[PDB]
Amino acid sequence: SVLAASKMVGAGCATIALAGVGAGLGVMFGSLINGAARNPNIAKQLVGYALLGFALTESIALFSLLVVFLILFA
Amino acid sequence: SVLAASKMVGAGCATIALAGVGAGLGVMFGSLINGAARNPNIAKQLVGYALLGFALTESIALFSLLVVFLILFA
Amino acid sequence: SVLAASKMVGAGCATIALAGVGAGLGVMFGSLINGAARNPNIAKQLVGYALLGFALTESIALFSLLVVFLILFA
Amino acid sequence: SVLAASKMVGAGCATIALAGVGAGLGVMFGSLINGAARNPNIAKQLVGYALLGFALTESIALFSLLVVFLILFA
Amino acid sequence: SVLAASKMVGAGCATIALAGVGAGLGVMFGSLINGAARNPNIAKQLVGYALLGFALTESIALFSLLVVFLILFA
Amino acid sequence: SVLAASKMVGAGCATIALAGVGAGLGVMFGSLINGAARNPNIAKQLVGYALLGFALTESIALFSLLVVFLILFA
Amino acid sequence: SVLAASKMVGAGCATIALAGVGAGLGVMFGSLINGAARNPNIAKQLVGYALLGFALTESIALFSLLVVFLILFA
Amino acid sequence: SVLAASKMVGAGCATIALAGVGAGLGVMFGSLINGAARNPNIAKQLVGYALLGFALTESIALFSLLVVFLILFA
Amino acid sequence: GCATIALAGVGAGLGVMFGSLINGAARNPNIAKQLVGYALLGFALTESIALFSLLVVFLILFA
Amino acid sequence: SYSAYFAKAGFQFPAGLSALVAGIVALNVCTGRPTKGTKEISNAEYNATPIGYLQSPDQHPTAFPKVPGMKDVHGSPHHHH
Amino acid sequence: MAVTSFLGKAFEKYFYDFSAYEQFGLNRFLSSKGQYVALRHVGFVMVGVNVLLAANFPFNPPFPTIGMCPAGWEGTWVCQADKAKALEMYKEWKKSN
Amino acid sequence: SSVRDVKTGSLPTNFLTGVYRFWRSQNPAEKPHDPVNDRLLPAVVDASDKRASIGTWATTFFCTIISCNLLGLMPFNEAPTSGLGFATGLGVSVWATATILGLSKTGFKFPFIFVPLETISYTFRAVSLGVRLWVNMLAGHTLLHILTGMALALPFSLGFFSMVPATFGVCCLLSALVGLEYLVAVLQSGVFSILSTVYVGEFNHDKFIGPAAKIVK
Amino acid sequence: EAAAPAGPKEFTEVWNKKAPSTLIVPEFPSNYTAVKAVGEGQVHGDAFPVNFYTPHSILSQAQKDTVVLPGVDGYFGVKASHVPTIAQLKPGVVELHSGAESEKFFVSGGFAFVHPNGVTDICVLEAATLDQVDPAAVKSALAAASAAQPTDEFEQAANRAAIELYSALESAVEAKA
Amino acid sequence: PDLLEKQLEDVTGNSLDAYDIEASHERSDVLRDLTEFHLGVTLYNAMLENNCS
Amino acid sequence: APSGPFYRVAGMSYLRYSNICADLLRNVLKEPFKAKAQARQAIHFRQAPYVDGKAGASKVYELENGIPKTAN
């Protein structure tokens, strides 16, 4: 069942594509803390930029998960 | 038994995506310490951003663990 | 069936281009937050540069995903 | 003994996610030293944030050690 | 069919050299943001500097994608 | 002898999680130098945080070496 | 024929050295932006520094490509 | 022909150090721009340090390029 | 083959240190020689890692 | 002063703990399925078989097993092997 | 006695002024009480592990051992790795002993 | 029938006062434009009862989850949140409460090539909110089981009360792990209820009624 | 947040209501400066106006092309259309260049601003030319400054400033061009 | 420093945020030092101009 | 107790630190310049607080050397 077996290690190697988006979400949500510690008055505009920048790099993780589930179940 | 071997080693190569999350959350929880040493007078706003950033970056870790559970026991 | 198996484990050993793409998106959309936290007066032109940097570093994301379409289906 | 060998070569590959949490705790406990070298009057709040960050990233460390025994003994 | 199976594994694991290039264009297009947030006088000249950097660090993306066609289709 | 040969490369692949603590301890112990060159007056409180961060980061090296010890010697 | 299959599976893991070259080019072409944003009259000399560094890292990029050619046609 | 196969797949995983020296050279040639934009009247001494650093960083690259042929052709 | 991947980290550390030398020399060019003494001392102290990961390679190859 | 008024009323449960214990017990007993390692058999089989054969080794582990897997009872030797 | 009043008084005195950090001296060897409970804690853990093991020592371990044997047993049922085989050997060691 | 008498200034009363006021401070009411007087007091009351009771819900979830977490650190006890159905049912319940509150605001109607990626990133937090609590309560307990299995090899193999540094260096490690599990048991209830306030207070927004007619000056 | 938009013009208008009307408006420090920060211009290519000031002197006011300022992170340089900066200076050498010729003032510290209109205002207390310091008394004083080390953090902070200024003076006097 | 001065500077953002603070510590301390230096300069020039007048 | 630079945390103002640095730069100057830099160094004035309107004690400064390096 090597055709069945290879998809598991393939998707296992493919979900490593979320390690870097975890690191990037960490540096972005740390940069928001260090930037909102400059001026607390613009700290609604900063979180409004943070969730936009999250939702356009979480989509990279979701593209990784779409490739994971089209290798696994397609 | 090659499929039930490839599932175990695919989960083992799947969970290494917990490295990048575990470093990004390190730089975010260090940026919390730094930005709360800059001006401590907003240190419930910045902890409130640290926990939003932690809880929105660890969704990546739970995506990784879901791919782990779905290539182990599914 | 080693060909149809190994093209799937190859394209599964392929997607972690998106990891570093997401880490770059994280540093870029965190540098946006620091930059618009410094001066909020140009805080829309900076987001324009952020989206142009997004669309020109996604270039690498689509360059990875069309190639893993070439491994999965071509 | 293909799976009883595969669990060992997966569990060895499973624990390399601890490198990310080691680097994360390194930078998060270095940021503590920088933050307590800036203003040592607030130096016992920052150790309190370092222990919160240490606990919420040892979260991810114990996630990786959960799967390193979920593919060994489970 | 280990030749074609192996070359699809090779062209798979080839494109994970796009990870660090995605992180590179992310660092570049992020420091573009605070470079425009420091002095907005130069921002159209400065994004010209950024795109001159982009069109030469994309050469690594082309250098990784021609070897994928050299592996698959040569 | 595929299981006892498996555990050796399992331990070898397992011990590369020490690279992350070997970089995190380096960046924390350089963070202490860059924080003590700023104010050399109070540079002996910060070693009390250097050794605390070193202990709580070594904990990951301890976990990695015990997963090594359990892969090798069950 | 494991030799002519190992050619391709070794070339795909040979070209993985382009990720570090992409990250290095990205931080250099991001520091070009930061440095030309400090004092934008040295921007000609700083672009001349960026292209010299870009050539001296294309040294190692073309070394990686000469190795990926030498294990495919030599 | 398994041994000549192993030499090629070992040289492929032996040229991975070129990514590390590429990223190191990139941060060094970005710091060249940053230091030359701090004080441009020291820029020739900075290039005299930059090319010494390049030549001594490529010592690691040639020590790694030493083994990429000493396992192939020796 | 996979043993010499540890030269990537030594190259990254040496590039970081020789970039920090360029920054620290651009911050006080009077002291632009003692810092190079610390630079080459730290470089020789991080060739320990390079020569360790080379003696493992010929202790793998020739033993 | 008022300290001896509160020592008179001793311990008292929280004021609706009866409903919580009744709800958790009614969730753990009104399951609508057999009781974790049993199977609903016919009346002829329950009337015809000994209580030593109705028991199973997997459902009676030993209280301090000297070897892991020691079971108290042994069940029917009439297996379907 | 009063079944709950004497017990409360006795546990109160044992909890508060009974100290083995003062009836045994121990300030010469231990620095402060913040270090004493950090060693009394792991001492309680160690003697609990040792009493729980010693209360039934002839047992085949459920926990994975490190390939180590307790004493002169070394091939018997208390060290046999497969637990069914170890039970088959224990059922022979039982009727002899 | 006859309720019990309560001492004022009891310690559980002060603790639950502080806890309820902490979770009520997370989604604060919005200041209007007109200063609050008898004219604006029905607008303030009717703004107050169109907002969800996130204070009460969040301290409900804080109390049940910190009690179920700290059950796992009592002897002879499991944590109920270590069960998959329990912890993930609490997570799905908070996500469903936020979703029902956000659906009842518009019309009970469910909301081109991008917004499915926002819907999948919103539907996943149902999984993430419960799985974070469950995996945190399972992982520390599992690691504690494995490592006190490894600590149990040494007094079994060596003598009882013998070779004491080798078992001391692992009993100290096990004690620090149970201390870390106490810290995680408090922090995961805190993180669950903080996220309940966030996810539910995303939809806690209505129109201020205000004065529609005014006698100015 | 800025609900009191004052200035010379607003104070002129409000001051004509509460003071007696025969009193002329008191002058303001704005009335003797033709140069501002937001007033764009004053750049003209390569040379920029360097207002090197002092409490007891004006050391330079003509336009120069590159200024080396000794900030607290380290020595930095200012070309013409530099980024706006408020830089605290450590004791170091402010180098004024007009080309090949360089005049080296060793200053005592004190801030140096770069404005959006490219004007740079170096603002230090004691700004000596490095010609008029002797190389003998600096180590002669640092030998005593490395001796009196009390627990008095006022005197210890003065000792820190003393050893740091004296060390920078030494490292600037051995390193002549 | 920010007791009223930066509070008088913030318009659609701020005018003080154009400048890169190159201090050792935060902006709240560089303005703390900078306004004491401004008071010393203004007081010195005031009592010098007043003596000459 | 305060949070700032090394002079600011020690209770010292910035002006005292910068004048201490100016004084220590002045003390090592050239002898055609050090004597005329003593003119710009002397502190001769007096002060007196006024609590009730006209009463108050006096505080006299006679300093020819510079600013007091000792605590204020």
Tab-separated table of N, CA and C in Angstrom, chain A residues 22-70:
chain	number	residue	atom	x	y	z
A	22	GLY	N	3.618	30.294	11.716
A	22	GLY	CA	3.586	30.480	13.157
A	22	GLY	C	4.646	31.454	13.629
A	23	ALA	N	5.849	31.354	13.060
A	23	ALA	CA	6.905	32.316	13.371
A	23	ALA	C	6.548	33.720	12.897
A	24	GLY	N	5.957	33.836	11.709
A	24	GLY	CA	5.591	35.147	11.198
A	24	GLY	C	4.448	35.781	11.964
A	25	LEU	N	3.474	34.976	12.386
A	25	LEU	CA	2.413	35.509	13.224
A	25	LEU	C	2.942	35.903	14.595
A	26	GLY	N	3.962	35.197	15.091
A	26	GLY	CA	4.604	35.613	16.326
A	26	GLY	C	5.359	36.927	16.210
A	27	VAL	N	6.112	37.115	15.122
A	27	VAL	CA	6.857	38.367	14.977
A	27	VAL	C	5.913	39.530	14.676
A	28	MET	N	4.790	39.281	13.992
A	28	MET	CA	3.862	40.371	13.707
A	28	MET	C	3.085	40.760	14.950
A	29	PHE	N	2.646	39.779	15.727
A	29	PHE	CA	1.937	40.108	16.945
A	29	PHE	C	2.863	40.474	18.091
A	30	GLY	N	4.176	40.384	17.909
A	30	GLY	CA	5.082	41.011	18.850
A	30	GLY	C	5.428	42.424	18.436
A	31	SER	N	5.516	42.626	17.124
A	31	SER	CA	5.757	43.952	16.584
A	31	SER	C	4.596	44.890	16.860
A	32	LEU	N	3.369	44.364	16.904
A	32	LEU	CA	2.242	45.200	17.301
A	32	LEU	C	2.339	45.628	18.757
A	33	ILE	N	2.822	44.750	19.635
A	33	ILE	CA	2.993	45.115	21.038
A	33	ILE	C	4.064	46.188	21.190
A	34	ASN	N	5.204	46.007	20.525
A	34	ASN	CA	6.266	47.002	20.617
A	34	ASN	C	5.911	48.302	19.907
A	35	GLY	N	5.001	48.271	18.935
A	35	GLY	CA	4.573	49.478	18.261
A	35	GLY	C	3.482	50.216	19.001
A	36	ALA	N	2.604	49.480	19.671
A	36	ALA	CA	1.585	50.084	20.514
A	36	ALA	C	2.135	50.532	21.857
A	37	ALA	N	3.336	50.090	22.228
A	37	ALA	CA	4.039	50.673	23.362
A	37	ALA	C	4.738	51.980	23.010
A	38	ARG	N	4.733	52.372	21.739
A	38	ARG	CA	5.172	53.708	21.365
A	38	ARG	C	4.061	54.721	21.603
A	39	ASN	N	2.944	54.572	20.904
A	39	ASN	CA	1.793	55.450	21.092
A	39	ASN	C	0.544	54.617	21.333
A	40	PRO	N	-0.001	54.621	22.552
A	40	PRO	CA	-1.224	53.854	22.828
A	40	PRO	C	-2.480	54.428	22.192
A	41	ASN	N	-2.425	55.630	21.621
A	41	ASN	CA	-3.624	56.260	21.086
A	41	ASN	C	-3.984	55.734	19.706
A	42	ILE	N	-3.019	55.175	18.988
A	42	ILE	CA	-3.242	54.650	17.650
A	42	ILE	C	-3.375	53.126	17.701
A	43	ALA	N	-3.566	52.592	18.907
A	43	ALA	CA	-3.611	51.160	19.145
A	43	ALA	C	-4.933	50.523	18.748
A	44	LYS	N	-5.860	51.271	18.159
A	44	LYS	CA	-6.947	50.614	17.452
A	44	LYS	C	-6.605	50.466	15.978
A	45	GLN	N	-5.932	51.470	15.412
A	45	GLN	CA	-5.469	51.398	14.033
A	45	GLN	C	-4.430	50.301	13.858
A	46	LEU	N	-3.606	50.081	14.882
A	46	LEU	CA	-2.586	49.039	14.803
A	46	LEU	C	-3.197	47.642	14.833
A	47	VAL	N	-4.223	47.420	15.660
A	47	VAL	CA	-4.858	46.102	15.685
A	47	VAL	C	-5.709	45.900	14.439
A	48	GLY	N	-6.287	46.981	13.904
A	48	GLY	CA	-6.970	46.890	12.627
A	48	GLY	C	-6.039	46.556	11.481
A	49	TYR	N	-4.776	46.977	11.575
A	49	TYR	CA	-3.788	46.529	10.600
A	49	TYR	C	-3.293	45.120	10.902
A	50	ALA	N	-3.285	44.727	12.176
A	50	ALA	CA	-2.769	43.417	12.555
A	50	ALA	C	-3.694	42.301	12.115
A	51	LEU	N	-5.000	42.494	12.255
A	51	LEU	CA	-5.907	41.425	11.865
A	51	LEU	C	-6.013	41.315	10.351
A	52	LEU	N	-5.837	42.430	9.636
A	52	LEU	CA	-5.734	42.371	8.182
A	52	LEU	C	-4.470	41.647	7.749
A	53	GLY	N	-3.332	41.976	8.359
A	53	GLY	CA	-2.098	41.293	8.021
A	53	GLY	C	-2.046	39.853	8.469
A	54	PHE	N	-2.808	39.500	9.502
A	54	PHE	CA	-2.965	38.112	9.906
A	54	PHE	C	-3.786	37.350	8.882
A	55	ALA	N	-4.925	37.923	8.481
A	55	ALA	CA	-5.866	37.226	7.617
A	55	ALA	C	-5.343	37.046	6.204
A	56	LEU	N	-4.295	37.766	5.821
A	56	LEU	CA	-3.650	37.570	4.533
A	56	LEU	C	-2.345	36.792	4.638
A	57	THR	N	-1.935	36.385	5.840
A	57	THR	CA	-0.896	35.374	5.982
A	57	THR	C	-1.405	34.094	6.631
A	58	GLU	N	-2.581	34.120	7.265
A	58	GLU	CA	-3.256	32.878	7.619
A	58	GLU	C	-3.785	32.166	6.385
A	59	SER	N	-4.092	32.918	5.325
A	59	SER	CA	-4.509	32.317	4.065
A	59	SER	C	-3.380	31.524	3.419
A	60	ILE	N	-2.127	31.871	3.717
A	60	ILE	CA	-1.001	31.039	3.302
A	60	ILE	C	-1.035	29.699	4.027
A	61	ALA	N	-1.308	29.727	5.337
A	61	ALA	CA	-1.483	28.492	6.095
A	61	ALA	C	-2.681	27.703	5.593
A	62	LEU	N	-3.768	28.394	5.242
A	62	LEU	CA	-4.934	27.699	4.713
A	62	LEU	C	-4.662	27.116	3.338
A	63	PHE	N	-3.773	27.729	2.555
A	63	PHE	CA	-3.387	27.123	1.283
A	63	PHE	C	-2.551	25.873	1.513
A	64	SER	N	-1.688	25.906	2.536
A	64	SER	CA	-0.955	24.708	2.941
A	64	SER	C	-1.902	23.602	3.384
A	65	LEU	N	-2.960	23.957	4.109
A	65	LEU	CA	-3.896	22.942	4.580
A	65	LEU	C	-4.799	22.438	3.464
A	66	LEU	N	-5.073	23.274	2.459
A	66	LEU	CA	-5.789	22.793	1.282
A	66	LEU	C	-4.938	21.823	0.477
A	67	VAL	N	-3.631	22.086	0.365
A	67	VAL	CA	-2.751	21.112	-0.283
A	67	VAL	C	-2.640	19.835	0.557
A	68	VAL	N	-2.640	19.964	1.891
A	68	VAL	CA	-2.595	18.798	2.779
A	68	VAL	C	-3.834	17.930	2.592
A	69	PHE	N	-5.012	18.547	2.552
A	69	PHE	CA	-6.220	17.746	2.414
A	69	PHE	C	-6.561	17.392	0.974
A	70	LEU	N	-5.876	17.951	-0.026
A	70	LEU	CA	-6.059	17.407	-1.366
A	70	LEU	C	-5.012	16.345	-1.684
